[PDB]
Amino acid sequence: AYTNSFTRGVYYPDKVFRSSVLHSTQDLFLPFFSNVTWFHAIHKRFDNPVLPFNDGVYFASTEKSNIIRGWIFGTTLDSKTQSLLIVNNATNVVIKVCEFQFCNDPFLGSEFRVYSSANNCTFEYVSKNLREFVFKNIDGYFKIYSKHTPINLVRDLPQGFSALEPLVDLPIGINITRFQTLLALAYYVGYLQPRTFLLKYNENGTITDAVDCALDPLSETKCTLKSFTVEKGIYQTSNFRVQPTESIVRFPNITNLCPFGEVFNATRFASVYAWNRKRISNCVADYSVLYNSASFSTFKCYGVSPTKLNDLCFTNVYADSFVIRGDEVRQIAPGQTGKIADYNYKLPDDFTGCVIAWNSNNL
Amino acid sequence: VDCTMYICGDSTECSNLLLQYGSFCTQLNRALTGIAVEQDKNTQEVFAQVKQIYKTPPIKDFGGFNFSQILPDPSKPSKRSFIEDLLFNKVTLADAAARDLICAQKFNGLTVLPPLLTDEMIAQYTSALLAGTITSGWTFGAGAALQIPFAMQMAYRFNGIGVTQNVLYENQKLIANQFNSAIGKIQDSLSSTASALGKLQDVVNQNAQALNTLVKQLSSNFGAISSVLNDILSRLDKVEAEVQIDRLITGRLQSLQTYVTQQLIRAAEIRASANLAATKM
Amino acid sequence: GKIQDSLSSTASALGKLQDVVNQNAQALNTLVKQLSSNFGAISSVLNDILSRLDKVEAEVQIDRLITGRLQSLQTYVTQQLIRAAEIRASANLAATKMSECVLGQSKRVDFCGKGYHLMSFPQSAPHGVVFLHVTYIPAQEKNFTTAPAICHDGKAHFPREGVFVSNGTHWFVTQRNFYEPQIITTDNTFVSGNCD
Amino acid sequence: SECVLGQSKRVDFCGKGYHLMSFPQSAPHGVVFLHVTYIPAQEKNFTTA
Amino acid sequence: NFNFNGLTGTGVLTESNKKFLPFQQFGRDIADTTDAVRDPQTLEILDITPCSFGGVSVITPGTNTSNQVAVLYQGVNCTEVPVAIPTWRVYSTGSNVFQTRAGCLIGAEHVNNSYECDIPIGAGICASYQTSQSIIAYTMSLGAENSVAYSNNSIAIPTNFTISVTTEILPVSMTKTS
Amino acid sequence: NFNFNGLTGTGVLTESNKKFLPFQQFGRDIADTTDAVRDPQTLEILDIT
Ligand SMILES: *[C@@H]1O[C@H](CO[C@@H]2O[C@@H](C)[C@@H](O)[C@@H](O)[C@@H]2O)[C@@H](O[C@@H]2O[C@H](CO)[C@@H](O)[C@H](O)[C@H]2NC(C)=O)[C@H](O)[C@H]1NC(C)=O
Ligand SMILES: *[C@@H]1O[C@H](CO)[C@@H](O[C@@H]2O[C@H](CO)[C@@H](O)[C@H](O)[C@H]2NC(C)=O)[C@H](O)[C@H]1NC(C)=O
Ligand SMILES: *[C@@H]1O[C@H](CO)[C@@H](O[C@@H]2O[C@H](CO)[C@@H](O)[C@H](O)[C@H]2NC(C)=O)[C@H](O)[C@H]1NC(C)=O
Ligand SMILES: *[C@@H]1O[C@H](CO)[C@@H](O[C@@H]2O[C@H](CO)[C@@H](O)[C@H](O)[C@H]2NC(C)=O)[C@H](O)[C@H]1NC(C)=O
Ligand SMILES: *[C@@H]1O[C@H](CO)[C@@H](O[C@@H]2O[C@H](CO)[C@@H](O)[C@H](O)[C@H]2NC(C)=O)[C@H](O)[C@H]1NC(C)=O
Ligand SMILES: *[C@@H]1O[C@H](CO)[C@@H](O[C@@H]2O[C@H](CO)[C@@H](O)[C@H](O)[C@H]2NC(C)=O)[C@H](O)[C@H]1NC(C)=O
Ligand SMILES: *[C@@H]1O[C@H](CO)[C@@H](O[C@@H]2O[C@H](CO)[C@@H](O)[C@H](O)[C@H]2NC(C)=O)[C@H](O)[C@H]1NC(C)=O
Ligand SMILES: *[C@@H]1O[C@H](CO)[C@@H](O[C@@H]2O[C@H](CO)[C@@H](O)[C@H](O)[C@H]2NC(C)=O)[C@H](O)[C@H]1NC(C)=O
Ligand SMILES: *[C@@H]1O[C@H](CO)[C@@H](O[C@@H]2O[C@H](CO)[C@@H](O)[C@H](O)[C@H]2NC(C)=O)[C@H](O)[C@H]1NC(C)=O
Ligand SMILES: *[C@@H]1O[C@H](CO)[C@@H](O)[C@H](O)[C@H]1NC(C)=O
Ligand SMILES: *[C@@H]1O[C@H](CO)[C@@H](O)[C@H](O)[C@H]1NC(C)=O
Ligand SMILES: *[C@@H]1O[C@H](CO)[C@@H](O)[C@H](O)[C@H]1NC(C)=O
Ligand SMILES: *[C@@H]1O[C@H](CO)[C@@H](O)[C@H](O)[C@H]1NC(C)=O
Ligand SMILES: *[C@@H]1O[C@H](CO)[C@@H](O)[C@H](O)[C@H]1NC(C)=O
Ligand SMILES: *[C@@H]1O[C@H](CO)[C@@H](O)[C@H](O)[C@H]1NC(C)=O
């Protein structure tokens, strides 16, 4: 089942007091009038399976008997990784981050049947109705916002505006990609997206209104004018710009593999005063084989990234090889000087190649 | 000119860096927007000085004065006068290659907005002003168009210069013949040489020169390993690409700041010319 | 009375003065907000850098802020110098209208409002001046037959001032800008030449 | 054009008082106008109707 | 997106009429963008022009009056607007689409009446919120059209007058920042 | 000079009437520039004038 998020899910983006002002912020928000999923848990739809977490979750409950009691968050949910438990028991809110082996169908009831075991626990804390929440993992923390509000309704998420205040800021490093609700023997889930919001702060510094700057052209005018009221006119809000339908790749259709093997694994190298040069051309290369070889003590590229080197084409390539002292490798760079750089092998100031060197004391 | 689309083209990577310079691109877009709206205001205050679109009568007995070169030509879709065609041609023989260049150069985020009033509308206002004058004297300026015979309008004009009006009426045929010949010399002069209209063709050449400079500034390196920003994105990983891109951003942004500053100054020069043209009207 | 009522009611009349306030306040706010821009430094709060980095690295980050903040002042002052030139032009115009419309009566058409100028009264406004241009507008025109001259006794008579008009049976002379007919008379006409 | 080549009725354009005539004088990077003007003086009161 | 021999960009690859000489590989724009390219496998020549773009200018009455708006996609043809932009496809699917010379106008009702220019658009087009209200778009009327009734012996003379008072406003100063 | 929770600068600390919300630690002017701070021990609000 589904329903519409009537401007719900705004939250105070940072711990800074502001008043009598309109402020633009870019953050993960629930887009206005989003298509949110609706669930009918009661002590009827009891199954209430695991859900993805994505970039972050908005959660709300319409309730009368405190049936909804918490959530678990994690990836594998099977003790092969750490996971986060949040639960509100009859006397305390409890938060723990352990390698939980959760039950196949976690519930409360006199009963607590959430997990079979917990180990390697690295964080713990112990502390008619609409209850609203937002959950984020960001910048090395797990962050939670909430508000509770009185209602009188039989079904569906109510209208009107209410900004969620920050609740807790857990310094926990775990990965999260899925979550599931914990229930005691209706709720709504929405997903956050990166959005630009204009927030209206009253004289007491509460957020009393917001504009989702992307929602529609009028909202974008409001946002680009930094004003909730817009006078009659024509306003140059934005750029229309057609996105690419697909990506076309057209490299040359040459099948001949480049003979890099015979320059790196040669039996005898040339004397540096008479450094050898081999032209590499009319062939297809695979620089990833060289870079990932891990056999080289030094691998320095100038004007070309080693990883992107495999995603590029060249008109010609020249492989130069020679042997020098380990202390002389530092001279094989653009703009260098010394007996080797001055009298044996000089690189140009604007060199565009790569320098690769390895210890050969075995040969 | 869109500041972000000029500086970064398609690149999202460059666009994210350009946000760290903050407001500069919003200032440049907004300054050019002001200049653009100024041009309609300049046109409005020169030509929309007449409240009503006055018409000449079909029976054009103006006492021997022959305005046929300067009154609208009904045979044409734009319905310019004959002299307004000679004017329109000699400047559009420049431009009004630059448009075609700018259209080719549009790939770099240039755009040219149409004016609010078309050539047809401006010629419709000059028609109303001219038809008002010859039929009603200065009176259509001060208020309602009070018709008066043109021979007697011209006799008022003579009193204004301190020549008694009988000098008009006793020499009206000579005075009309002199006028008709002088209008002929105007027609010949504009048909003969474009060089009279140099003031209009110069502002066209200056705006064309400013954009062709602004386009060529994309070809600069500003010290970056390539002028073509897509090369860097194809060739360096982010930690090194950012240093190269930031050189292009800096130099391309200073190219816009120079252009927008000089166009703000030219906008004041043209507005001073428009204020004069409005006062002459 | 209509001036008082209009200024009491419409918002758009004083647009030029409010706009000048808007543009200058907007420029200041924009100049302040450019202090929050990083220009590639690790922070735009300059005290962060000097607490967080050692000197020879800090100088690299600080010089980015100095470059971008100096570029922000050059942008502000450049645009204020251009705006100052615009205000100078309005000030020279307002001074000329004080000279010619207030201290005088201007023959210049549409310079001191629509209609023929009678007089103007200056009123001060925030950062500006308001001229109440009092003007005469011809109204309720009637049509007449007219002629350049009267032929009498074989000689042509022309008006000394005004214009000849006929109501269809009688010929009169009258002033051009207000119908007050008078008998065509040797006192208000002058002769020149024969009628032919 | 207006003060030297003509007589200007434009108040306070060609100096104070009623403009009679003006003389141009050259100066470094500029021009100097000597505006000659009639200023009325020694007024007396009268009854009027 | 295209990537020829590593030369990478975005555009609408098109069969070129431009006759490259047999050795030539790229064709260049004055700004060093790629004007044309040779396919490395068929050796055919392709024109490249960029995917279209333009200013989204949003036309609105005051929010005090209405939340209706119209959108002018400046400089782009209406047949190309609906696909992409940050996305409001429900506008492009509306019944109101109208090709001005300024660009595609969406969400305004074109009418054949003419009025004074309320909101300017360009090329003689203006738009207004009018009646059941909608944003209409129309060619602006320059003024009432009048025949002066001239004749070689007719004069009009005012029998009366109006004393008019006209407010003119001029800026004189701006705030003395330092 | 002041350091509040790392917020380092110079100003005239003044007793505020601006009612921070309980979670808020700092306060800013309309310009998004620092204007007040919550003392981390007394929890009172100071105008950083
Ligand atoms: C002024 O008169 C014109 C027509 O002039 C006629 O000849 C004059 C010498 C005098 O004898 C007038 O009484 C005559 O009528 C009027 O023009 C008409 O205006 C109406 C619109 O109001 C228009 O529909 C007609 O086509 C016009 N007629 C012509 C021939 O152009 C005009 O209305 C008169 N104005 C006033 C204020 O009385
Ligand atoms: C967090 O966990 C998710 C799995 O739930 C990881 O996502 C996978 O990442 C690899 C690449 O490293 C992909 O091949 C898989 O397809 C991804 N799986 C899903 C379901 O997206 C993610 O990498 C983890 N992140 C960290 C930082 O550990
Ligand atoms: C809710 O959970 C908390 C633990 O997080 C329980 O509190 C503990 O209760 C036991 C007695 O059963 C005490 O010995 C502990 O000292 C308590 N710990 C804390 C931190 O207070 C609480 O009892 C639970 N509620 C219910 C109803 O079982
Ligand atoms: C608690 O965590 C540690 C690692 O942090 C787990 O140690 C691993 O144990 C398995 C055997 O069960 C070994 O194969 C791994 O190599 C160990 N990892 C490391 C890094 O030493 C430990 O098993 C966890 N405790 C429980 C009860 O599972
Ligand atoms: C902001 O807070 C003030 C108090 O700090 C509120 O003022 C009170 O408002 C109620 C009515 O709701 C009055 O009965 C009180 O007398 C007011 N107190 C004072 C000291 O004036 C004000 O309503 C709040 N406003 C908002 C928008 O939150
Ligand atoms: C008014 O001037 C026009 C020219 O603009 C005259 O029209 C020309 O008349 C001659 C015949 O005498 C033709 O050979 C030309 O082709 C006409 N030119 C145009 C453009 O029509 C017109 O005859 C003049 N009328 C009066 C009364 O002087
Ligand atoms: C004033 O000058 C005009 C010329 O501008 C004279 O008019 C010419 O007179 C001769 C006859 O003497 C004619 O052949 C020409 O065709 C006339 N020219 C025009 C344009 O009509 C006029 O005669 C002069 N009058 C006096 C008193 O000197
Ligand atoms: C034109 O004006 C003359 C005035 O000079 C009018 O003559 C008067 O006409 C009325 C009758 O309508 C007589 O009672 C007066 O005695 C006449 N006065 C004179 C001096 O003759 C004349 O009627 C007017 N004609 C029109 C058509 O308006
Ligand atoms: C707007 O786009 C349409 C096509 O999407 C153009 O219409 C076509 O124009 C060509 C000539 O260029 C004709 O051969 C086709 O028959 C037209 N097709 C249709 C369906 O009308 C239209 O000309 C474009 N207009 C502008 C101003 O760019
Ligand atoms: C919400 O989206 C789902 C698909 O993700 C769709 O099945 C459902 O119909 C949408 N909601 C409504 C009310 O249509
Ligand atoms: C050199 O030989 C080793 C195997 O002995 C091989 O792994 C390596 O790829 C060869 N070098 C190159 C450049 O391929
Ligand atoms: C690539 O294949 C085409 C046929 O699809 C062939 O004509 C062409 O010669 C090939 N490329 C080269 C470099 O030979
Ligand atoms: C809004 O409209 C009302 C009239 O309905 C008017 O009184 C009010 O001043 C208007 N406000 C604005 C900001 O236009
Ligand atoms: C507008 O006028 C044209 C003719 O100029 C006509 O073809 C068209 O149907 C009219 N449209 C409407 C909506 O009346
Ligand atoms: C810090 O000290 C103040 C007294 O100066 C006291 O009121 C406050 O409670 C203390 N902080 C905590 C966390 O107890």
Side-chain angles (χ1 to χ4, degrees):
Chain A
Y2 297 95
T3 190
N4 189 10
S5 63
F6 301 103
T7 75
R8 288 281 169 160
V10 177
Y11 65 89
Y12 292 82
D14 52 29
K15 300 189 175 183
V16 180
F17 172 83
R18 310 170 198 274
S19 64
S20 305
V21 73
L22 311 178
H23 185 275
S24 295
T25 185
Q26 199 279 358
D27 208 338
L28 280 60
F29 294 100
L30 178 67
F32 275 12
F33 310 102
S34 293
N35 179 13
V36 302
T37 310
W38 181 8
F39 302 92
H40 296 76
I42 191 164
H43 173 43
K44 180 188 298 178
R45 292 297 299 112
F46 51 82
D47 294 302
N48 296 288
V50 183
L51 294 174
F53 190 80
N54 300 312
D55 299 337
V57 174
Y58 165 86
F59 186 103
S61 176
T62 46
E63 249 181 311
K64 61 189 172 71
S65 311
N66 302 314
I67 298 300
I68 292 143
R69 297 303 207 76
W71 314 263
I72 54 167
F73 308 85
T75 60
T76 66
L77 311 176
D78 69 350
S79 79
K80 301 191 191 98
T81 62
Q82 284 193 317
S83 296
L84 163 68
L85 168 64
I86 301 189
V87 65
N88 190 341
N89 82 20
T91 60
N92 306 83
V93 175
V94 180
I95 300 186
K96 288 187 66 139
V97 179
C98 320
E99 297 189 311
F100 295 102
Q101 177 55 66
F102 299 113
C103 297
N104 184 58
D105 185 10
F107 62 79
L108 309 189
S110 299
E111 300 177 70
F112 182 101
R113 304 192 194 261
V114 184
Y115 57 84
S116 307
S117 64
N119 197 272
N120 284 320
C121 213
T122 55
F123 182 94
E124 175 175 300
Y125 166 73
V126 181
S127 194
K128 292 179 179 181
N129 299 83
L130 169 56
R131 306 190 198 273
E132 300 190 69
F133 307 84
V134 166
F135 306 91
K136 294 172 71 180
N137 70 302
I138 189 61
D139 61 72
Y141 298 80
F142 188 85
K143 307 189 186 182
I144 311 182
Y145 307 76
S146 69
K147 186 162 280 281
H148 303 167
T149 302
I151 56 162
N152 192 307
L153 58 90
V154 176
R155 63 182 290 277
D156 203 8
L157 190 76
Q159 314 305 126
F161 189 80
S162 184
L164 313 188
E165 295 169 35
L167 180 66
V168 65
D169 178 18
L170 306 178
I172 64 175
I174 65 164
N175 188 3
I176 295 167
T177 59
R178 297 190 298 155
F179 85 102
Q180 187 170 228
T181 313
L182 279 46
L183 304 172
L185 302 183
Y187 68 91
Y188 318 83
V189 178
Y191 292 103
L192 311 180
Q193 292 179 356
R195 297 291 272 213
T196 305
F197 269 58
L198 181 79
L199 301 175
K200 179 173 177 73
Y201 292 80
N202 72 6
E203 66 274 12
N204 293 332
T206 75
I207 297 163
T208 58
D209 208 352
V211 177
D212 182 357
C213 296
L215 171 65
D216 65 33
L218 177 58
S219 305
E220 194 176 28
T221 63
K222 285 180 180 182
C223 189
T224 53
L225 298 168
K226 311 293 178 183
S227 180
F228 277 63
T229 183
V230 174
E231 297 86 357
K232 178 170 60 175
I234 180 167
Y235 301 99
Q236 186 149 226
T237 55
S238 219
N239 293 306
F240 160 89
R241 178 159 56 208
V242 178
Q243 306 297 349
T245 59
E246 63 181 288
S247 304
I248 293 171
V249 183
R250 302 294 288 179
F251 286 1
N253 51 314
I254 294 174
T255 57
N256 177 38
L257 282 159
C258 296
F260 291 108
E262 66 176 48
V263 307
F264 283 94
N265 292 326
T267 54
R268 173 179 271 100
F269 273 40
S271 285
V272 70
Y273 83 96
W275 55 271
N276 183 268
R277 171 163 283 187
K278 185 179 291 269
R279 183 177 172 231
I280 304 295
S281 291
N282 307 306
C283 66
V284 66
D286 197 343
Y287 300 102
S288 70
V289 178
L290 285 62
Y291 189 59
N292 302 337
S293 185
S295 54
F296 308 120
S297 72
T298 299
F299 198 124
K300 284 282 172 275
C301 298
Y302 303 93
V304 184
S305 178
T307 56
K308 293 187 183 288
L309 181 65
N310 228 11
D311 307 328
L312 189 54
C313 304
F314 302 110
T315 61
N316 299 279
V317 178
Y318 297 93
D320 306 339
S321 68
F322 47 83
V323 167
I324 57 174
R325 271 177 55 191
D327 273 320
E328 293 171 327
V329 176
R330 60 177 64 97
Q331 298 190 25
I332 314 304
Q336 291 298 332
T337 60
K339 294 293 188 175
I340 303 310
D342 300 335
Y343 309 133
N344 296 262
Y345 183 78
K346 183 74 186 191
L347 289 179
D349 313 304
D350 63 353
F351 182 55
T352 54
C354 296
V355 175
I356 303 162
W358 64 104
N359 183 297
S360 64
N361 196 47
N362 64 315
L363 300 177
Chain B
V1 184
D2 184 279
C3 175
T4 73
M5 194 134 52
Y6 174 87
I7 292 170
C8 292
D10 312 271
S11 172
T12 296
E13 309 86 344
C14 176
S15 300
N16 293 342
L17 290 168
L18 185 59
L19 294 179
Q20 303 216 54
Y21 288 80
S23 177
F24 286 135
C25 279
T26 297
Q27 294 165 48
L28 296 163
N29 286 22
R30 190 168 65 216
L32 291 177
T33 300
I35 292 159
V37 171
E38 200 92 292
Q39 306 315 312
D40 298 324
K41 187 180 181 72
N42 293 348
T43 309
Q44 186 83 6
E45 73 174 72
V46 181
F47 295 108
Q49 297 202 4
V50 71
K51 191 173 181 180
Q52 302 188 57
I53 301 305
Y54 298 114
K55 309 288 282 200
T56 56
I59 303 163
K60 292 178 173 64
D61 185 7
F62 299 119
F65 297 82
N66 184 347
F67 308 119
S68 60
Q69 287 91 339
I70 65 166
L71 283 172
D73 183 348
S75 68
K76 289 159 181 160
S78 181
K79 205 197 64 179
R80 289 183 305 246
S81 79
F82 191 103
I83 280 166
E84 286 177 317
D85 289 327
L86 272 47
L87 294 171
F88 182 88
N89 296 345
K90 295 308 181 183
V91 189
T92 58
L93 282 172
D95 195 19
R99 195 197 299 155
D100 179 49
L101 292 172
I102 292 158
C103 280
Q105 295 157 353
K106 185 178 65 177
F107 308 178
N108 312 288
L110 315 178
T111 179
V112 172
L113 291 67
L116 181 59
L117 298 172
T118 59
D119 177 55
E120 292 80 4
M121 289 180 169
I122 293 167
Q124 189 82 324
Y125 279 126
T126 59
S127 175
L129 291 155
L130 172 58
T133 294
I134 68 185
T135 60
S136 73
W138 43 74
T139 70
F140 82 107
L146 307 177
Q147 81 284 355
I148 183 172
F150 186 79
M152 296 182 71
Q153 165 170 187
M154 200 62 147
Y156 293 4
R157 304 312 189 136
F158 268 59
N159 282 136
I161 66 164
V163 181
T164 56
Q165 56 178 317
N166 71 299
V167 180
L168 182 288
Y169 302 127
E170 294 172 33
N171 295 174
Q172 181 181 331
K173 192 174 66 179
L174 171 63
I175 290 165
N177 291 175
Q178 286 184 351
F179 174 74
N180 299 346
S181 305
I183 294 288
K185 292 180 183 291
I186 299 317
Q187 184 183 24
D188 292 347
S189 179
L190 296 173
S191 184
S192 177
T193 183
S195 65
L197 310 187
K199 291 187 178 181
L200 305 182
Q201 200 174 137
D202 184 74
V203 60
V204 171
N205 293 346
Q206 286 195 54
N207 281 277
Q209 176 175 260
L211 286 161
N212 283 282
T213 305
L214 180 68
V215 165
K216 285 176 177 282
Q217 282 294 97
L218 291 160
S219 294
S220 296
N221 285 67
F222 308 110
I225 58 165
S226 177
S227 170
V228 188
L229 188 144
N230 291 10
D231 292 351
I232 297 157
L233 297 177
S234 304
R235 183 173 154 189
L236 297 185
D237 57 294
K238 190 173 182 179
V239 178
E240 298 188 19
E242 285 183 353
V243 179
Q244 296 297 324
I245 291 161
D246 190 46
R247 278 184 166 278
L248 295 181
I249 288 173
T250 302
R252 292 175 180 198
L253 182 58
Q254 286 184 233
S255 301
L256 278 169
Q257 285 178 346
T258 303
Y259 168 82
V260 177
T261 296
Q262 292 186 346
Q263 293 297 108
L264 282 171
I265 295 160
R266 289 187 183 106
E269 297 169 24
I270 295 296
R271 184 153 181 67
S273 306
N275 295 152
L276 179 59
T279 306
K280 302 247 179 176
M281 195 73 75
Chain C
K2 294 183 188 290
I3 306 314
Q4 176 191 41
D5 290 348
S6 178
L7 294 174
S8 301
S9 308
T10 190
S12 60
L14 309 191
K16 294 182 180 180
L17 302 181
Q18 185 61 62
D19 186 27
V20 165
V21 173
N22 293 351
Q23 299 311 323
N24 283 281
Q26 180 160 256
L28 281 162
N29 293 351
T30 300
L31 173 68
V32 171
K33 287 179 179 182
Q34 278 295 74
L35 294 172
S36 306
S37 303
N38 294 340
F39 311 109
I42 66 164
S43 177
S44 60
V45 179
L46 187 142
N47 301 342
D48 294 349
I49 292 163
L50 301 180
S51 307
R52 185 170 173 179
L53 301 185
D54 198 7
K55 180 177 170 187
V56 177
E57 295 195 320
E59 288 183 358
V60 180
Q61 307 309 322
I62 298 293
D63 191 41
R64 283 183 165 279
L65 297 185
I66 292 175
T67 301
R69 291 176 176 196
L70 178 55
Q71 186 182 14
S72 301
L73 281 174
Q74 283 175 358
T75 302
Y76 174 69
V77 178
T78 298
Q79 292 177 358
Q80 290 302 109
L81 286 169
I82 296 161
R83 286 182 186 116
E86 296 177 26
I87 295 293
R88 191 85 188 108
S90 305
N92 297 147
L93 183 60
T96 305
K97 297 204 180 194
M98 195 74 72
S99 303
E100 297 184 30
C101 310
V102 181
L103 275 65
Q105 183 183 16
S106 196
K107 301 182 193 292
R108 296 173 63 183
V109 169
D110 302 358
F111 188 64
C112 314
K114 272 290 188 192
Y116 310 130
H117 182 240
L118 296 173
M119 58 180 68
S120 304
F121 307 118
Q123 300 287 268
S124 58
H127 296 313
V129 68
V130 175
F131 296 103
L132 305 181
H133 299 298
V134 192
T135 69
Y136 176 105
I137 296 181
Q140 298 151 36
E141 69 287 345
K142 286 190 182 184
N143 289 307
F144 302 93
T145 299
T146 190
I150 294 302
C151 182
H152 169 253
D153 199 21
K155 56 180 178 184
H157 293 259
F158 306 89
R160 291 188 200 276
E161 303 96 28
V163 70
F164 298 136
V165 283
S166 180
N167 71 354
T169 60
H170 288 76
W171 277 99
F172 306 95
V173 66
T174 195
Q175 64 193 277
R176 300 173 178 164
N177 292 299
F178 184 81
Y179 183 64
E180 184 206 303
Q182 297 190 3
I183 308 98
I184 305 184
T185 304
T186 306
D187 291 347
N188 60 33
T189 55
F190 71 90
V191 175
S192 181
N194 70 62
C195 303
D196 295 352
Chain D
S1 312
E2 297 185 26
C3 307
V4 181
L5 273 61
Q7 184 184 17
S8 194
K9 277 73 173 192
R10 295 173 62 187
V11 172
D12 176 55
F13 192 65
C14 313
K16 251 56 56 178
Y18 309 131
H19 181 241
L20 300 177
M21 62 175 68
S22 304
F23 307 119
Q25 299 287 267
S26 58
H29 295 304
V31 66
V32 176
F33 296 105
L34 306 180
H35 299 300
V36 190
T37 67
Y38 180 103
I39 291 181
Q42 296 178 319
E43 66 268 36
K44 207 177 81 77
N45 279 301
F46 301 97
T47 295
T48 189
Chain E
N1 296 324
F2 62 79
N3 177 355
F4 292 97
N5 310 319
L7 171 64
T8 297
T10 309
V12 289
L13 307 182
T14 297
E15 299 193 345
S16 189
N17 69 338
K18 308 188 189 192
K19 295 183 182 182
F20 278 32
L21 289 65
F23 58 89
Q24 293 171 330
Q25 305 303 316
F26 310 138
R28 279 193 180 202
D29 185 29
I30 178 172
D32 289 284
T33 81
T34 297
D35 174 66
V37 63
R38 183 183 300 276
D39 181 80
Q41 314 193 346
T42 70
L43 311 181
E44 81 199 76
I45 305 305
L46 302 170
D47 290 343
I48 308 191
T49 55
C51 307
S52 66
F53 74 84
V56 173
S57 287
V58 179
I59 290 144
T60 186
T63 50
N64 195 18
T65 298
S66 190
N67 292 337
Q68 293 190 34
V69 300
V71 183
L72 180 76
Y73 294 82
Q74 291 169 177
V76 54
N77 182 313
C78 290
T79 62
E80 193 165 69
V81 173
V83 301
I85 296 183
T87 281
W88 329 291
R89 192 173 68 93
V90 298
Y91 285 81
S92 79
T93 59
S95 307
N96 291 304
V97 178
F98 173 54
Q99 182 68 63
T100 80
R101 297 189 182 104
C104 189
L105 182 66
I106 297 194
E109 178 177 8
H110 175 255
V111 302
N112 280 344
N113 292 3
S114 289
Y115 310 100
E116 297 184 56
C117 188
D118 188 17
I119 307 168
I121 285 181
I125 305 298
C126 300
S128 185
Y129 187 69
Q130 302 195 20
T131 59
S132 61
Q133 303 278 9
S134 64
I135 298 178
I136 58 161
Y138 54 89
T139 298
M140 64 183 281
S141 182
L142 302 190
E145 189 172 20
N146 183 315
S147 296
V148 184
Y150 174 94
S151 179
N152 70 5
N153 67 81
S154 179
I155 197 171
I157 300 188
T159 70
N160 205 347
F161 51 73
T162 292
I163 306 302
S164 183
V165 182
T166 293
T167 312
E168 173 169 33
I169 302 101
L170 281 163
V172 174
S173 293
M174 61 180 198
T175 190
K176 292 174 61 183
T177 297
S178 190
Chain F
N1 303 314
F2 58 77
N3 185 342
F4 284 91
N5 311 319
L7 172 60
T8 301
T10 309
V12 179
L13 304 181
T14 303
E15 301 196 319
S16 193
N17 60 4
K18 302 190 182 190
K19 297 184 181 184
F20 284 24
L21 285 71
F23 60 89
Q24 292 169 340
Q25 306 304 312
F26 307 106
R28 293 185 183 184
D29 183 75
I30 304 300
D32 197 8
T33 57
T34 299
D35 183 48
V37 68
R38 184 181 297 276
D39 180 79
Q41 306 187 355
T42 73
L43 311 180
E44 81 198 75
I45 308 308
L46 305 170
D47 290 344
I48 307 190
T49 316

